[PDB]
Amino acid sequence: WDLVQTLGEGAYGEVQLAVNRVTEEAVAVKIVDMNIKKEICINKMLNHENVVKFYGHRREGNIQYLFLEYCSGGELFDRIEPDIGMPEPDAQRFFHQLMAGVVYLHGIGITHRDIKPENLLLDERDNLKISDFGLATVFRYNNRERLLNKMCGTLPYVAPELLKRREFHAEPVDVWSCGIVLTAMLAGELPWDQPSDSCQEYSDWKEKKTYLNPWKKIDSAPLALLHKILVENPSARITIPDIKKDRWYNKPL
Numbered sequence: 001w002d003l004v005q006t007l008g009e010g011a012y013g014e015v016q017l018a019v020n021r022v023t024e025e026a027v028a029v030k031i032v033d034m035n036i037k038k039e040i041c042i043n044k045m046l047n048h049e050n051v052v053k054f055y056g057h058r059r060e061g062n063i064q065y066l067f068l069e070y071c072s073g074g075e076l077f078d079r080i081e082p083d084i085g086m087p088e089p090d091a092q093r094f095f096h097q098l099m100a101g102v103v104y105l106h107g108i109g110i111t112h113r114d115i116k117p118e119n120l121l122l123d124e125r126d127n128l129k130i131s132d133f134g135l136a137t138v139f140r141y142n143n144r145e146r147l148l149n150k151m152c153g154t155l156p157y158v159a160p161e162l163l164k165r166r167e168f169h170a171e172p173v174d175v176w177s178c179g180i181v182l183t184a185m186l187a188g189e190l191p192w193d194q195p196s197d198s199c200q201e202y203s204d205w206k207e208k209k210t211y212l213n214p215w216k217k218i219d220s221a222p223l224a225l226l227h228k229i230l231v232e233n234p235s236a237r238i239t240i241p242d243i244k245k246d247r248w249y250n251k252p253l
């Protein structure tokens with residue numbers, strides 16, 4: 001493989017675009033200097049259209065190479081116009097695909113714990129794929145669930161129970177982050193810096209002050225679904241089987 005260019009760079013390491021010397025086949029290579037062992041272990045379990053395909057891995061010295069399907073459409077983050085978002089049919093289409101991916105992971109007892117537009121890739125046909133399983137874990141062993149207690153994710157995307165409870169159910173945490181992603185796609189704005197009564201924007205949402213931004217930019221139909229997902233009590237929060245039945249979710253656009 002010839003490393004053509006950087007696709008992403010950070011504290012975690014880097015992602016390179018690699019093109020095959022003879023075939024001209026393009027793949028993405030995640031290069032990490034030794035967590036990653038768990039990322040590899042989780043990746044080996046996955047097989048679905050709405051998850052970044054894992055080809056395999058190779059360790060050279062103390063550096064890990066993860067061979068992944070190349071997603072030429074880039075991050076969902078870059079499709080979100082600041083303070084605008086994107087057209088409602090596009091947001092709906094990406095939300096459907098996001099839900100399909102999350103259903104798949106939850107079905108095999110895996111929680112992502114880092115759902116955000118920067119961790120959602122688009123392929124050459126604009127198909128959405130869940131990416132970066134470095135914070136992911138097993139929450140169900142054999143029809144038997146375990147509660148989680150890890151402080152994973154970026155505060156604007158995290159569910160409020162992470163700040164309140166000693167331990168919590170895995171699935172409502174991913175459902176909440178998907179709701180934040182949906183808000184960002186529809187209005188191009190994160191609704192609150194923190195999911196706490198101490199954050200004015202969070203208190204405003206709980207008080208139903210939807211004449212304020214970002215809610216004033218969102219249509220009544222997706223707003224009604226957002227009112228069901230962004231529920232503080234994880235026990236009262238909408239489950240994915242009920243999201244699949246929502247009026248806006250099933251509205252042809």
Ligand SMILES: C[C@H]1NCCC[C@@H]1Nc1ncc(C(N)=O)c2sc(-c3ccccc3)cc12
Pocket residue numbers: 007008009015027028052068069070071072073074075118119120121131132
């Ligand atoms: C998704 C991002 N989450 C934070 C860590 C970095 C990560 N970046 C990437 N990871 C993997 C791939 C892949 N599997 O193809 C790609 S592709 C790409 C891209 C393509 C086109 C334009 C602009 C960017 C970025 C990227």
